[PDB]
Symmetry: none
Subunit: 73 residues, 2 copies
Amino acid sequence: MQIFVKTLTGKTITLEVEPSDTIENVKAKIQDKEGIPPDQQRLIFAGKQLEDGRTLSDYNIQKESTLHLVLLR
Amino acid sequence: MQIFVKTLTGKTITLEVEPSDTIENVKAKIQDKEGIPPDQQRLIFAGKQLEDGRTLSDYNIQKESTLHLVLLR
């Protein structure tokens, strides 16, 4: 499916994922495209922080949903 | 979750923590970002001093709650 990842500043990135993908998988796709290591990535969906080990399907992320990415510890 | 730590003088710091984090854990995160050793940190929430050994969940600190940090003995 296709999801969107929006930064604080405005820039969007399109990703290709499955509900089965884990959150760390997702950060690795964000790593592939923008060079941001996963450890510097905080992902949010509807006010909830997405925790490693979980999948997309754990959070009601659907086709063409938009996460927010917040960028050191 | 995300909590805020406000100094007497105004400056805020954003932290990433869990309810499970101990107070000394919290001071160590404040150490990571601002270089203040934990032994010089006094943390307050709603008029209560936060004591080492306890966790956040011991004090009704929640998402986007704001502690106050007071800075030698």
